[PDB]
Each structure stands twice: as C-alpha cells, then as structure tokens.
Design goal:
Length: 218
C-alpha cells in the first residue's frame, strides 16, 4: 500500500544529527545549506533538536490566529499556519531527496506514521484526523501531540515535524494552532502522566523516521 516501498530518490543511509538547542533562524539556515548539499549529490539528513521558545507562521496564517498577547512571530516558508516551538518539544527536520514525480502527501503521511509508531511504542493509541496533518489522540476535544509542516524545493524536503514531549503547553493557548479552534494540544507527558523528555525519545524518533521513509516500519 501507500506506505510500502521508499519515497526517497537515493537509498543511502540517512545522516542523523542529534543537535541540542538551536535558534530557529540558525537551524533554518542549516536546513537550506543541507538541502543544497543534497541536491549537489550529498547525503539525506535528519536534524533532531530543540528550539528556544518561538512562534512561527507559514504564509497561510491569518491575522486573528496570531498571539492574543502580541508576542512576535517568525514568518517561515513551511506549509501550515501558526505553531509554537520551545523547550521540551522535539523538532525534526528531515532534509531528504524525494523521488519524482513528487508525492508530498505521502511524505507527510510517512512522517505521521513514524510519530504514531513512537507513540504506540510508549503504549499510547494515536493516529490521524483526516485533513488535519499531524498526530492526534482521540477525544472530545481531539488532542494533537505532534505537528507537521513541510516544504519541498528542488525535490528535497525542508522543515518537518514537532513532537510535544514535556513542553509547557500554555503557549498554544494564545494562538489558533494550525488554524484549528475546536481541538486541543497535548504532550507525551500529559498523556502518560509522567515526565517524558525529549532526550528519552530522540533515538526512537530517529529510527522511526528513517524506517518510515523506506517503508520498513514495524
Ligand atoms: C500548522 C503548523 C504546524 C507546523 C509544524 C512545524 C514543525 C517543524 C499546520 C497547519 O496549518 O496545518
């Protein structure tokens, strides 16, 4: 099915870089540098990092979705509307050459599957809500544990995902996150009733992403 096989143009090992806390702009610059290196024939890369607290807005963000307290926002070129990154949220930036003709939806679906599996491996039952990319726990309201916002340029991916581990969720209350006003944002820690850190899930996230891209998630 759609998840089988590989989305990649080259079957070489992904270079996984476990970074620390990296300013949003600095990381964005590195993403672009790595993407150019990939087009020049270099490796596929997966950056895993945390950002200092920041709101970011893709082009589709609407004015009323911005912080109700006037907090500044970084405009960014990924898909999606507004989100927040900060301590305790694991941000992943897969910088991957995709096979052409492109299937960006399938790429997003593979990132979702990777994070669904990470949740499953912790004993949680997460999945998709069609039309609302990312990873959700069912409920009324439904609870979003991971966000996705990507862009593909020159058949190479940019941006990625963000998995809420033990971050303070209060930042999400000041915005309309990803254009959604009828739901909620959660974290692994809130769902499991214990602190689940970024560092505890770094390795399993890396493994899951790399497996999903090549169709070999368990
Ligand atoms: C809202 C934005 C989520 C961006 C996540 C970026 C992770 C690096 C998505 C939407 O509007 O659908």
């Amino acid at each position: 099915g759609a998840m089988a096989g590989s989305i990649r143009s080259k079957l070489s090992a992904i270079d996984v870089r476990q970074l620390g806390t990296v300013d949003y702009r600095t990381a964005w610059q590195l993403q672009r540098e790595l993407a150019d290196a990939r087009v020049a024939g270099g490796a596929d890369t997966l950056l895993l990092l945390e950002h200092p607290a920041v709101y970011t807005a893709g082009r589709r963000t609407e004015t009323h979705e911005r912080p109700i307290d006037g907090t500044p926002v970084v405009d960014t070129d990924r898909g999606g509307k507004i989100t927040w990154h900060g301590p305790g949220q694991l941000v992943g930036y897969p910088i991957i050459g995709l096979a052409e003709p492109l299937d960006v939806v399938n790429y997003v679906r593979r990132l979702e599957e990777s994070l669904i599996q990470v949740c499953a491996d912790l004993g949680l039952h997460a999945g998709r809500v069609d039309g609302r990319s990312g990873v959700w726990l069912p409920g009324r309201p439904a609870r979003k544990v991971a966000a996705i916002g990507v862009r593909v340029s020159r058949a190479t991916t940019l941006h990625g995902f963000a998995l809420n581990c033990d971050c303070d969720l209060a930042a999400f209350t000041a915005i309309v996150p990803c254009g959604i006003s009828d739901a909620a944002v959660t974290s692994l820690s809130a769902e499991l009733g214990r602190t689940v850190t970024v560092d505890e899930v770094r390795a399993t996230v890396a493994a899951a992403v790399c497996a999903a891209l090549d169709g070999v998630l368990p």
